[PDB]
Design a protein around this ligand. Structure first.
Ligand code: ZN
Ligand code: ZN
Lengths: 156, 156
């Protein structure tokens, strides 16, 4: 049962349980984890190579895709398993088969809960630095029984 | 200024700032960080090699020192810069010149605040799993301008 980055996932699991206990609904929990991601995305953008490797003018869905690839290589030393520009019209969908956030997590009866919504917030924060108004949510999470984690980035 | 594990560092930084805003004294903030550490410590003991690589019967000061070395190897893939059972008789002092928690943090003021007290709690929790009663506190932190981070493990 090998775990990568045990400190990070233990701290995140703590935040997830705290969030679930301090909110009234699954949707409120999703939004609170997104807010957490937006708050830590500020430091993650400025304190890492992301602010140096990304360009100032992010205009198109293809530019957003490139920006996502830069985030992934800087934070996780890999590419996303898929970036899908066509299935959700007006969106960019990102797939990760080995998400760091939910390793070995198994929640039942919580299919509406985006366990890894912190990453939705981190992407919204980075796009906001580029003055790209975006809405990001998690479509699927291995934590709730899916085969991969998938986030949906809508430029809106 | 390159940072190791930027997601962990930023998430922890969020926790510290929220803790400082919610507590009524620096020592209360210190205690909240140690309590977070104890919770993290439970997860890192159950979900890493620490439990499989450490002795079951920890009886001497020398045994506690070797346990600390194993924690450091598993969590950080390094040894502490110093483990001191000399300067503080009855306690064990751990020195880390490149602490993960406070990379690039430079607080102003905050005398008495241990930015990295989360690791005091992790240590206290692991020792507790080994039936070793300890109180752990941070002597100094690079976040408040020291050149090193030092934690003091007091036995009994
Ligand atoms: Zn995930
Ligand atoms: Zn430190």
């Amino acid at each position: 049962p090998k775990i990568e980055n045990p400190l990070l996932i233990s701290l995140y699991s703590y935040y997830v349980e705290k969030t679930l206990s301090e909110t009234k609904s699954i949707e409120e929990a999703n939004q609170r984890l997104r807010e957490l991601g937006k708050e830590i995305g500020q430091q993650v953008y400025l304190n890492t190579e992301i602010v140096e490797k990304t360009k100032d003018n992010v205009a198109t869905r293809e530019d957003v895709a490139k920006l996502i690839e830069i985030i992934y290589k800087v934070l996780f030393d890999k590419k996303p398993n898929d970036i899908d520009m066509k299935s959700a019209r007006g969106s960019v969908r990102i797939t990760d088969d080995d998400c760091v956030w939910c390793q070995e997590v198994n929640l039942e009866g919580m299919r509406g809960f985006g366990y890894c919504e912190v990453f939705s917030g981190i992407l919204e924060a980075v796009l906001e630095f580029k003055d790209v108004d975006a809405k990001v949510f998690q479509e699927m999470s291995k934590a709730t029984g899916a085969d991969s984690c998938i986030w949906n980035v809508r430029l809106v």
